[PDB]
């Protein structure tokens, strides 16, 4: 199971904390799952290689300061923009044991 608050609320210009705690997680991914246009990967916290934000968020996406791992797949969406508002979804792909995913909402 993945632990994520259903709703996350960030005021403008704040580092919204996207939570994704698994109960070891090999990799976490976050994406913006909203619609055809709003179907974009946001960041990939791969445990062995680090965070790899996507081209449109390389600056507004960063993981919490050490040491939050293990099993913490949190990523903070700072300087949140009114547009950022939208449902996201974690995928915690726990290995040596399988796969998962959880939705979320951010309401800026």
């Amino acid at each position: 199971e993945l632990e994520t608050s259903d709703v996350v609320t960030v005021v403008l210009g704040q580092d919204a904390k996207l939570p994704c705690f698994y109960r070891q997680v090999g990799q976490v991914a976050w994406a913006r799952v909203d619609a055809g246009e709003g179907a974009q990967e946001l960041a990939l916290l791969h445990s062995k290689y680090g965070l790899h934000v996507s081209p449109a968020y390389e600056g507004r996406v960063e993981q919490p300061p050490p040491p939050r791992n293990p099993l913490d797949g949190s990523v903070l969406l700072r300087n949140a923009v009114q547009a950022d508002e939208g449902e996201y979804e974690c995928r915690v792909s726990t290995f040596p044991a399988g796969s998962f995913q959880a939705r979320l909402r951010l309401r800026v």
């Epitope: 991914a29 974009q40 290689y49 790899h52 081209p55 390389e58 995928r91 792909s93």
Partner: antibody, heavy 119, light 114 residues
Framework: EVQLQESGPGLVKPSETLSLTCTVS????????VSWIRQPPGKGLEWIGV???????YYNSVLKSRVTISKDNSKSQVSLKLSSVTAADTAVYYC?????????????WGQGTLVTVSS | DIVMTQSPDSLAVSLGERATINCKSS????????????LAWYQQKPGQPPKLLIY???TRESGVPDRFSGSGSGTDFTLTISSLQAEDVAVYYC?????????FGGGTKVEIKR
């Protein structure tokens, strides 16, 4: 060492389903992503979809509703299945490895395969 | 869907001369936060799979000779093969790798005036 081999049926009856396969080798399909591009003979490249190492699949809007990418991390195999293959689906299909984790420029490519929808 | 429009469609240049293959995007390929522009130039020579040349508009890729000096920003970008030695007679495609669905442009076929 990063080698992608694309093998599939070549001649497909109209209204059928192509089913090429891309045997990746030398890179862990668990970490890197592979996408499928096609290039209609004598035309521009087209994107079909990307299967990121975690199994999230992104498809082009146009060929969607008619495509399916999947992989087997175990056998280093990625596969394309396009439904209702029709006149326009004739092309050289390509599988390329995404350059890096969540990087959208396809650094390594496959040689290609001409699927020919025909009667 | 970012629309990438290369221009011109076809280009003829002598061996020594500069080539420029402009490319345009309905959407900017710029991350202000990162100050990176994400546009990649490929090189589909006759009968071969496309080969990336320049990611990040400017950053080339190991092996790509310096003649291929890519540049540009926003929605206006540009490839420049400084001296079009003959082998560089392929079709060059600009791809936006800013987001999905990746989109390539038409391709500017370059040629040589002997």
């Amino acid at each position: 060492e990063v080698q992608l081999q694309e093998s599939g049926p070549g001649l497909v009856k109209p209204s059928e389903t192509l089913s090429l396969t891309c045997t990746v080798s030398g890179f862990s399909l668990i970490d890197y992503g592979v996408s499928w591009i096609r290039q209609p003979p004598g035309k521009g490249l087209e994107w079909i979809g990307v299967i990121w190492g975690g199994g999230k699949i992104y498809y082009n809007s146009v060929l969607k509703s008619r495509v399916t990418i999947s992989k087997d991390n175990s056998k280093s195999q990625v596969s394309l299945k396009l439904s209702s293959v029709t006149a326009a689906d004739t092309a050289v299909y390509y599988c390329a490895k995404q350059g890096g984790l969540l990087f959208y420029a396809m650094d390594y490519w496959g040689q290609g395969t001409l699927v020919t929808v025909s009667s | 869907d970012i629309v990438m429009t290369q221009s011109p469609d076809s280009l003829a240049v002598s061996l020594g001369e500069r080539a420029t293959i402009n490319c345009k995007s309905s959407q900017s390929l710029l991350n202000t936060y990162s100050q990176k522009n994400y546009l990649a130039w490929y090189q589909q020579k006759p009968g071969q799979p496309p080969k990336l040349l320049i990611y990040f508009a400017s950053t080339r890729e190991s092996g790509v000779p310096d003649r291929f000096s890519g540049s540009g920003s926003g929605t206006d970008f540009t490839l420049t093969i400084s001296s079009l030695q003959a082998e560089d007679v392929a079709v060059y495609y600009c791809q936006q790798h800013y987001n999905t669905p990746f989109t390539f442009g038409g391709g500017t076929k370059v040629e040589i005036k002997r």
